[PDB]
Design a protein around this nucleic acid. Structure first.
Lengths: 94, 97, 48, 116, 52, 133, 125
RNA sequence: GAAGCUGCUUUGAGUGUAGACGAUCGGUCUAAGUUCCUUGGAACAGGACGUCAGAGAGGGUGAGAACCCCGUCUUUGGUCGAUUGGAUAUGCCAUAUAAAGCGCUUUCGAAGAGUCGAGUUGUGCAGCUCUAAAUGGGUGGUUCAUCUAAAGCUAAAUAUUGGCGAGAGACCGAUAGCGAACAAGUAGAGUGAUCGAAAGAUGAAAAGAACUUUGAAAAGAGAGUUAAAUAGUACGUGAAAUUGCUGAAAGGGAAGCAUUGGAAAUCAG
RNA sequence: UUUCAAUGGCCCGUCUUGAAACACGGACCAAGGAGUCUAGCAUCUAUGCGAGUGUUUGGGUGAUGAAAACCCAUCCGCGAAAUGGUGAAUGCAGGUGGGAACGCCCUGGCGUGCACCAUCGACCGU
RNA sequence: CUGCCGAAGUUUCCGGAUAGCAGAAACUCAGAUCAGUUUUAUGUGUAAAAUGAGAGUU
RNA sequence: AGAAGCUCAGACGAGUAGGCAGGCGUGGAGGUUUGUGACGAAGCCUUGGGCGUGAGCCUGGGUCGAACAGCCUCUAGU
RNA sequence: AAAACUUUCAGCAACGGAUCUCUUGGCUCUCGCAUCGAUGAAGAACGCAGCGAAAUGCGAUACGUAAUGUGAAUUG
């Protein structure tokens, strides 16, 4: 439409086409090797974090989570020590 | 739609302080149903607590009769007749700052 | 409830059955479905 | 001047990709920091509890974290907020203390010369 | 049964959804009219198309 | 109004059923029911479960086993706590009203079920809703 | 169905690419199937045509005629075959062009380059 | 925060190699009928018999092609090179007489001026005149609360009719859609600033009409090519207005129209 | 269908006026050509739910087109209380009459009496 | 494009609100009320038989 | 018995402003017709025929040469 | 009162370019990306092919040279 755009529409030189428009592709994992091995590329990060035994956010989630199946006072607290947390997943144990 | 418009047929014819209010009759409705089955109609030593502030209400008004079961009403403000009916029903009012 | 027989890969009836879900007893409304479909089949319309 | 929202689905997917790109960079760790719990500043909202910006310097000190390593392990600091009541202090100390118990800290590599 | 629930049981995969209830119980009024209860009380059935 | 603007097939089925009952009987009840089925939603206000409970045991009470009939929705009344035994036939019941009546009370009926039980409207209380809106 | 967002299913863009493709691409556009004996010999479904290739016309008015390739007219997608011509009014011979997809290769013009291409496309030479 | 003290916890602005995980660029790899009959100039049509399918998107090919061709799917990858990113493992080097966090104090703690502000004149900001302070000053609220100006930097979420590309659409279909589907800001107009069109389609293939004859020639007539010249470049289809020819009929200063029939023509049951 | 005969037939649109006539428009044909889209408000109707109601700011999710469909955490909008701070059954959430509808009778009588409307009544509009 | 319903053509108060004529929706009314009408009676006006029509309101 | 339907009887019929209802046609979309089509789709022409009160529809013949329609809904640069 | 002329109807031929069918174009929406110049840019002028006017390409190395990829054309 533009004089610049019509300039290369009538020009014989081919366009500088780069085929980078692949949507639906989720970024692959670098960083941790243990995460990369146990990470599957189809699932979302919230699904991968939950499966691996990790937290995607330490806060509340600002939406309704998915449901795939029908599931079935200072002193005593300021100085208390939380007895760590158990490792439920082999990856978390790893 | 343009098709159902009547101009398709004219073709050819030349053309303050935030304080929501709750009344006494709805005080028991605010409480869930399983607690009402447990506390309403039974003379239990422990009484249910209805914090009407957490349910988005600022003042408790006096419309309605409460059942004779006592209940502790925690609120910010309460009409004078409302807490009259509350102790007549056996309950108490704890004003919340 | 009524039961529906399950069919194997070769079309033979399997001995297992499932009770008919309540959704199959829901009211069948041509008028309501047509109106919902009219509005829902409009939600992937690009502008012009 | 009319603003249109035809790119509303395009924006939603772009952010989900951006979250995915974050997790690619930093995989074993959450894509969000831990925010404190605070009470909104009005008579209309003070009954509720929402997420603040960061944990005050007293909340970090009471929990056992220093204000220098707090950012390293992902704990935001708010130098502006202060603890006017023990209720707010004890609430956010346990928010950190739960965080520290649930946290795995991978060791770094420390350079050490031949002599001391 | 979990996706849609029933008319008295909540859907497990849809929070607070019950199946809709119908206007009528039996959707066949022809047998409703020809039932014994209604036929025994209706007045005398007048003629069909009459002679001019 | 010779027909309703509603395209609901089941409302048309009710209209067909009460077209026959109105003309093949001599019940002023059935003629009234047919007219109210034709009436638009504006002219068919909802009636509360409490007003139904009131109008049954009102003044001399004497509700006995009479079935309440309203051409409209029977909305629940959460203010009233202990629900009496009632038998109501209506176009629609809100999920609360249907659950409350069934749990502590009698039964809910549709307009076709009532036409089978009381084709001539015998022992039926025809109740309307307040139009003051 | 296409699933890539990099391939265009537009008729407008497909005709523009086909009719504006350069000679290096028109070489791959004008391919012909190998014959039965050649296919069972080379395990190759199809090859791009080349001058001095013995083919056999399969479809058209010239069905059954056999000959070599004298010139692949890449700029109009036509193949020219010897002894397949049209006699004009003035007696001159105008060779008749056939689309490459309408012939079948019966004897390849093997070179070093074609041999590597044969074994490149999963074939045995 | 400085300075002292204390005793616990800390540490590389190096330099190679290896392999893994990513990003970018280019090359490369890819399943199944072109079997039979009929129609046709051409089969890609209909029928018969089959095949492939993680491929039945789309386009090309002499008419509707999943199986003739490019592709498509596999690819949310194989392979070959490149160019790179942050980690991991490991080698070498390390100027540590060093640097830091936390904790303790019988020791200290600087904080931005023709700026704030007052007056006045303009539209918080600016001009003019005057011109400060140090628990001072700013801003709020009924003494209190909050903040720390007159110096500076800073990613992400955000915008995007342009620039480099891409994929689409219940959009327009050549008086439409951009002014411009062709030739387009072109031809053309104006001293100049500027203004600014019209114009798409032969056929599958140019096979674009050899040859003969008339004619000064343009062309005509036979001929020839084609499935077709009722496709001849004044080229798909060819409407109406309008014009010529032929046939039929009517007409003494309008005509068209309507009703009922005759005559002539032509249909129907 | 064309034509003839008898009978009839003033040029259409617009404008002005009580009304015409005037006054404009109309050489002919083809194509184009004028109550549209959107924001708000109100009526009516339909639909879903109903003292509730509203998923689509956003998040989750969606391999087959992923701008669709699907799921919903916290808020918020309107409604549920009015009056000018306070803040509602006195009395089956009040009696009388008319009244839809039903029942019992031996047309009419009796009982029950929705909606709505006049009536005495209250409570802080209910 | 066809079909159905169908006016006002002007009072009364300040361009209007009003009324009037035309429709719609929802009510009650048939042992009832109406009427561009005529008689009868009382003194042109008022009141109660003839004839026609189902008549009302919001 | 497409109760949306079937049937009987009577009365009525101009109609501006206005009010109300049912229909005809067009481009594109979802569904559908085991739909039509190079043995000729669409278009166009015709002193050919038929249907409808009407908007219009179907068809014979000729011409033409690649697409098109009926029904149910959606939509509008109708 | 025959022809001409005028008019009407039909046929053929003209003129015209409607209609139909499509279409390497427009328009609209979304998506990814960030890259002009004193190391001479955008724009202008003149040139360059065996046979060329525009467009395209290019700059006296002038419808291009080097390198790389492909592997046998270009075509009036």
């Amino acid at each position: 439409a533009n004089p610049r755009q019509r300039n290369k529409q009538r020009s014989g030189k081919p366009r500088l086409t780069r085929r980078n428009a692949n949507k639906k592709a989720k970024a692959k994992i670098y960083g941790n090797f243990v995460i990369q091995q146990n990470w599957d590329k189809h699932a979302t990060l919230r699904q991968n974090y939950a499966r691996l035994g990790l937290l995607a956010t330490p806060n509340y989630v600002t939406g309704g989570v998915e449901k795939l199946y029908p599931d079935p006072t200072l002193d005593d607290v300021l100085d208390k020590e939380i007895s760590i947390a158990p490792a439920k997943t082999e990856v978390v144990r790893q | 739609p343009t098709h159902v418009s009547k101009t398709r047929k004219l073709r050819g014819h030349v053309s303050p302080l935030w304080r929501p209010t709750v009344n006494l009759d709805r005080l028991w409705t605010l409480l869930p149903n399983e607690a009402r089955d447990k506390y309403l109609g039974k003379n239990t030593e422990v009484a249910p607590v209805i914090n009407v502030l957490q349910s988005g209400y600022g003042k408790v008004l006096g419309k309605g009769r409460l059942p004779e079961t006592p209940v502790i009403v925690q609120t910010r403000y309460v009409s004078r007749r409302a807490e009259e009916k509350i102790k007549q029903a056996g309950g108490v009012v704890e004003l919340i700052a | 409830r009524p039961t529906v027989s399950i069919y194997n890969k070769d079309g033979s009836v399997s001995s297992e059955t499932l009770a008919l879900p309540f959704v199959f007893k829901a009211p069948i409304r041509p008028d309501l479905v047509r109106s919902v479909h009219t509005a829902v089949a409009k939600n992937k319309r690009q502008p012009y | 001047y009319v603003k249109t929202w035809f790119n509303q689905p395009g924006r939603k997917l772009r952010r989900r990709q951006a979250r995915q790109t974050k997790a690619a960079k930093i995989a074993p760790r959450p894509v969000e920091a831990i925010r404190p719990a605070v009470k909104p500043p009005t008579i209309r909202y003070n009954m509720k509890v929402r997420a603040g910006r960061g944990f005050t310097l007293e909340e970090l000190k009471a929990a056992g974290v220093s204000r220098r390593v707090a950012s390293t392990i992902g704990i935001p600091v708010d130098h502006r907020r202060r603890n006017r009541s023990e209720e707010s202090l004890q609430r956010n100390v346990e928010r950190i203390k739960v965080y520290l118990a649930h946290l795995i800290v991978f060791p770094r590599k420390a350079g050490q010369p031949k002599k001391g | 049964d979990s996706v849609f629930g029933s008319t008295t049981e909540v859907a497990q995969l849809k929070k607070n959804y019950f199946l809709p209830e119908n206007i009528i119980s039996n959707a066949d009024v022809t047998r409703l009219i020809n039932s014994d209860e209604i036929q025994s009380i209706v007045k005398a059935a007048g003629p069909s198309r009459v002679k001019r | 109004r010779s027909k309703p603007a509603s395209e609901n097939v089941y409302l048309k089925l009710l209209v067909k059923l009460y077209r026959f009952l109105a003309r093949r009987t001599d019940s002023r009840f059935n003629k009234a029911i047919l007219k109210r089925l034709f009436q638009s939603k504006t002219n068919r206000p909802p009636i509360s479960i409490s007003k139904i409970a009131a109008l049954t045991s009102r003044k001399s009470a004497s509700s006995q086993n009479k079935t309440t009939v309203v051409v409209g929705t029977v909305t629940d009344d959460e203010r009233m706590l202990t629900v009496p035994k009632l038998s109501i036939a209506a176009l629609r019941f809100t999920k609360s009203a249907r659950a409350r009546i069934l749990k502590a009370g009698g039964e809910v009926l549709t307009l076709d079920q009532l036409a089978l039980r009381a084709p001539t409207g015998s022992n039926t209380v025809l109740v309307r809703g307040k139009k003051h809106a | 169905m296409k699933f890539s967002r990099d391939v265009t299913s537009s008729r407008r863009k497909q005709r523009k690419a086909h009719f504006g493709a350069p000679s290096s691409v028109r070489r791959v556009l004008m391919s012909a199937p190998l014959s039965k004996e050649l296919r069972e010999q080379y395990k190759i479904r199809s090859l791009p045509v080349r001058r001095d290739d013995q083919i056999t016309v399969i479809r058209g008015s010239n069905k059954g005629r056999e000959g070599k390739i004298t010139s692949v007219y890449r700029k109009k997608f036509l193949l020219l075959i010897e002894r397949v011509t049209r006699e004009k009014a003035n007696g001159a011979s105008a060779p008749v062009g056939i689309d490459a997809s309408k012939v079948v290769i019966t004897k390849l013009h093997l070179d070093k380059d074609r041999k590597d291409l044969i074994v490149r496309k999963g074939g045995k030479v």
